Design a binder for this molecule. Structure first.
Ligand code: DFP
Ligand code: DFP
Ligand code: CL
Ligand code: CL
Ligand code: CL
Ligand code: MG
Lengths: 224, 213
């Protein structure tokens, strides 16, 4: 086991309706987070598997870089797949993990505190980032990779400024070398929860492709 | 935890290709299965949650009725659903299990061994998509309700099915399983199906094939 990195937009300005929309003003008030934001699975409490290392206010929206480093995750995922799942392919442990995570949890969801009537946004606003199948906000696909620079590279419209600032802030996060241990039983439950809550979702792979387009990540072709 | 009943066609005559196709003669020789047919999740060993109570040779294909009686199954599925999934509904624990099973494991898959006789059929695995045409299942609180939605199931076959199932020795059994093992089996179902495209279209087609409305 070693750590893996995850990144993407947490929202895109002007791209959501109503209650979901995150405005430039809210994001400016919310950053930097008052404490580090954890990364959990499907908003479940007690199943943190990483932490956001940096959030940047890019021109198109707030963009994050996270680390996921739960030793048991690879084990639980590998035990779940049938014996001939990867066929003839030879892959490292790290690459199987990346493949399964990428496809089991291809999106992110930023969760915020519910503010009271007339309570102003501040740095306590953002609570956590949940990995999920489809986020409710436009363009909230994630990329996972074995290093931070590779995790962020696919986002073609991320500005260079914001990219540099992001990578710099992340390189000095307290959470950068942390490890999140969980029992296998707890992790298994957390992953099953994602499946059960998303079982009814229609057209999930077209929705994933749409999120990818919205984010500016080169679309996955399936024509060969 | 009263038991769960499950039913459906194990195959339809004249509808599968080659390796999957079951003929009438072969089916007639295979019934009645000469020992009880376990019900499991995805053909997994050490993962029995039920048994087939009867199979009948309906005009359209072999049709089964089973009982699933595994206390831990209800608990594992119910823990998994997020706190808003049922809206402002209040479901009983049994109605919730029925719903979640219905949608988590909507199909069945009959496995055999390799002259043909009553030992041929081995077990029935619950799954997301069965390889054979029309292998949807219905789950419900009684055998009557479990078989009701199959419009094309013959009255004769339905009556023979319900009567044999009412006499089955397995009808009151219980299958205690560890929550840990169950949670693994269910997670395996999700990971092995995660990449499946248009799953609910394939299920709707299975349903139409079985003659469910
Ligand atoms: P998120 O996108 O939710 C935030 C709007 C709180 O995740 C969904 C899939 C529940
Ligand atoms: P079943 O339909 O397979 C029988 C033909 C053994 O299960 C599939 C999903 C493998
Ligand atoms: Cl009849
Ligand atoms: Cl799909
Ligand atoms: Cl679908
Ligand atoms: Mg009913």
């Amino acid at each position: 086991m070693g750590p893996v990195y995850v990144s993407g937009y947490l929202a895109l300005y002007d791209r959501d309706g109503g209650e979901l929309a995150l405005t430039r003003e809210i994001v400016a008030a919310a950053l930097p987070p008052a404490g580090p934001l954890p990364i959990n699975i499907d908003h479940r409490p007690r199943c943190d598997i990483g932490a956001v290392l940096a959030v940047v206010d890019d021109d198109r929206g707030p963009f994050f870089l996270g680390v996921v480093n739960c030793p048991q995750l690879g084990a639980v995922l590998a035990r779940a797949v049938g014996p001939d799942f990867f066929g003839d392919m030879r892959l490292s442990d790290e690459e199987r993990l990346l493949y399964l995570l990428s496809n089991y949890l291809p999106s992110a969801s930023l969760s915020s505190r519910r503010l009271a009537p007339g309570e102003a946004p501040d740095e306590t606003l953002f609570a956590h980032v949940a990995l999920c199948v489809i986020g409710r906000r436009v363009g909230t696909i994630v990329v996972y990779d074995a290093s931070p620079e590779a995790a962020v590279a696919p986002f073609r419209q991320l500005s260079a400024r914001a990219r540099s600032e992001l990578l710099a802030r992340a390189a000095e996060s307290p959470d950068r070398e942390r490890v999140w241990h969980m029992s296998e039983e707890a992790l298994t439950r957390a992953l099953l929860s994602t499946a059960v809550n998303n079982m009814l979702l229609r057209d999930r792979w077209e929705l994933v492709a749409a999120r990818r387009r919205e984010a500016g990540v080169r679309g996955h072709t399936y024509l060969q």
